[PDB]
Symmetry: C3
Subunit: 148 residues, 3 copies
């Protein structure tokens, strides 16, 4: 199998796919909140679900959208950086640590966001998860630059 | 050519590039709607196009932005999942079907969204397109996990 | 090193990683603006930073979010298109030019957006940067289609 193209690749693919699934979970939760709170973004949706007054904003729907947006601001860059980093021959354990810190930090971020946990818990989880991303980005920069 | 690195890859690259172009079409439509409805997001834009009163929201611009955001929530994960899945040696026809269902579902989603089609047409197209994404994600999970 | 899998790859990886870092800079700036203007998105954040009245919108925070969103609408597609394009055996100089126009255009876009530069400076930088993206997308389409 081509999953063994590099020793770090299986770990990267596991963490990254779990994070994609975690984003899908946020999308599904958002839909559930829209239904339960009757807060739809579109008149056509609202008319099917009780009337035009249900095309409206809701603070919990907005919170779900913020968590999903923050995921897009961070997880998408990781999918790129982690893939490239997997092929730079990093120490297997060190690579695993980078991916695991990102995975745990991001899952914790969504829990802290949707769970409305006290500040600065969410901010700390965000920062933690970005650390391995910064590390991988710098490593890629050096490797790319030196091959120019 | 390296497009033949796997039998499923050409189909994946065709569908994924068409979807990127489809996102670009949404960006261009959004700009056209801003101009036609004189609804700009920035004072500097509004002042060039008739006055400060034209820095304002518009329901059709907001709808375009929702479609584009939903694209980012779904097409970007597909670009990752479909690329990896192409290298897991899937049945060629089965892979083609996964990519085609996603392509058709997503094009239909944008038509249903921007066309203001009755509910639940958009919701159904969304769900349809996510099915092959869930399928690919699970397959990647098993392949990655078993190589740990 | 696997960075030399294709002659264009090091240049692509350099430009793409710099652009990811540039997105991270926008995220950090956004946080600084939230703090300085006391405009937080969440009640839990506001209560830590002076009171519930500080959960509020701010035009500069909104502008930062627009720049970051526009980045997600454009840089993420580039990460995909440029990666694939690097493996289609393009002329090295021509490829470098595609990546450099995108890099310069996007950095200029963020400067024009956050700097509130007069129209149509931002719109021009956006258009410039999209040109190589359109070019790469078409090239990928032909290469993928002909291998079906
Ligand atoms: C992400 C994902 C991944 C994998 C599979 C997925 C399958 C479905 C799926 N949806 C997202 C939530 C969405 C939703 O709840 N929308 C509500 C608001 C508008 O009105 C709707 C009709 O009443 C209900 C749903 C169930 C229609 C489709 N998402 C998926
Ligand atoms: C996505 C894509 C892909 C490939 C090539 C592309 C080329 C351009 C291009 N734009 C997106 C729409 C955008 C727009 O219509 N903005 C209006 C609102 C603000 O004010 C503007 C100046 O009056 C008009 C435009 C034409 C300036 C640039 N997009 C592209
Ligand atoms: C992108 C990136 C890349 C690499 C490393 C990074 C490290 C941190 C980092 N943050 C983004 C900005 C964010 C922020 O300023 N938020 C303010 C608003 C809410 O309240 C906060 C607590 O008072 C302050 C911060 C510093 C907590 C975390 N970003 C990073
Ligand atoms: C990957 C998806 C993670 C979902 C985490 C959801 C955490 C929800 O947690 C809940 O949050 C509520 C406030 O929103 C509180 O009232 C509840 O006490 C708490 O259980
Ligand atoms: C604001 C703090 C966030 C930045 C986190 C820095 C991550 C450190 O990253 C490290 O950088 C070194 C020098 O480039 C490299 O030699 C290491 O391989 C890399 O792990
Ligand atoms: C990939 C881009 C797909 C663009 C699909 C646009 C569909 C527009 O469709 C139009 O929608 C209008 C309401 O918005 C209706 O008034 C019109 O009858 C209908 O033709
Ligand atoms: C809520 C319903 C959405 C989930 C769609 C499930 C997609 C099924 O996906 C299937 O999963 C099987 C078991 O892992 C695998 O053996 C198959 O290869 C895979 O196609
Ligand atoms: C990659 C990050 C680029 C950051 C570019 C920030 C440009 C800020 O530029 C500043 O903009 C202000 C208005 O916002 C003006 O008042 C100042 O004159 C100007 O210096
Ligand atoms: C609206 C204008 C934006 C579109 C920019 C067009 C970019 C041109 O792209 C070119 O297309 C040719 C034909 O497919 C190819 O032969 C070239 O390799 C490619 O560089
Ligand atoms: N887009 C972000 C940029 C900065 C950021 O990502 N901050 C982290 C830590 S405070 C966060 O969880 N932001 C909440 C959010 O993005 O909604 C924002 O507006 O806050
Ligand atoms: N961000 C989405 C998450 C759920 C979702 O993607 N739902 C689909 C089917 S109802 C959709 O088309 N949502 C419209 C949208 O994202 O604006 C939302 O707010 O609805
Ligand atoms: N989502 C974009 C789509 C069109 C676009 O990307 N336009 C460029 C050039 S005018 C832009 O800088 N838009 C500003 C923005 O996205 O906030 C929008 O709403 O304008």
């Amino acid at each position: 199998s081509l999953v063994m193209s590099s020793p770090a690749l299986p770990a990267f693919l596991l963490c990254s796919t779990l994070l994609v699934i975690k984003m899908y979970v946020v999308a599904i939760i958002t839909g559930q909140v829209r239904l339960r709170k009757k807060a739809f973004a579109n008149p056509e949706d609202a008319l099917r679900h009780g009337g035009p007054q249900y095309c409206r904003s809701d603070p919990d729907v907005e919170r779900c959208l913020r968590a999903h947006r923050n995921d897009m601001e961070t997880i998408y860059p990781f999918l790129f950086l982690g893939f490239v980093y997997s092929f730079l021959g990093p120490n297997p354990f060190v690579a695993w640590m980078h991916f695991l810190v990102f995975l745990v930090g991001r899952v914790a971020h969504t829990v802290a966001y949707l769970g409305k946990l006290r500040a600065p818990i969410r901010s700390v989880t965000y920062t933690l998860a970005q650390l391995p991303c910064a590390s991988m980005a710098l490593q890629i920069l050096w490797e790319a630059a030196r091959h120019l």
